[PDB]
Amino acid sequence: DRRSFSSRTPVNENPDGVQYRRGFVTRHQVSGWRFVMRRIASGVALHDTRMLVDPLRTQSRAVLTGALILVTGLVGCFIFS
Amino acid sequence: SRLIFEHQRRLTPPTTRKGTITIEPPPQLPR
Numbered sequence A: 001d002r003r004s005f006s007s008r009t010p011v012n013e014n015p016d017g018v019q020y021r022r023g024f025v026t027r028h029q030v031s032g033w034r035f036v037m038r039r040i041a042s043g044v045a046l047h048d049t050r051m052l053v054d055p056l057r058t059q060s061r062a063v064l065t066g067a068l069i070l071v072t073g074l075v076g077c078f079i080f081s
Numbered sequence B: 001s002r003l004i005f006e007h008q009r010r011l012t013p014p015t016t017r018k019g020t021i022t023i024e025p026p027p028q029l030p031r
Helices: A027-040 A055-078
Strands: none
């Protein structure tokens, strides 16, 4: 196709790679933390951690769409006046 | 006259690992 390049980090064998000292959080780390905290909260409530269907995310996204419908109704009734 | 020297084994040199390091070629600009 186009012969892309996967993410790679070889071993260093050199005294620079031990010197990073920075903590910066990626998109993959925050998505992995979202997945772990949605597997634990579906592991102390649903008591099954297969994560096929997660109902807590369904409820929380339902109340978030409620708040979003509130905000869109506010921006719709503000432009009326 | 002149003192004797004995043919010891030399000290070991710091080794030169003569490996053939390979670099993966870059990607190919899709368009």
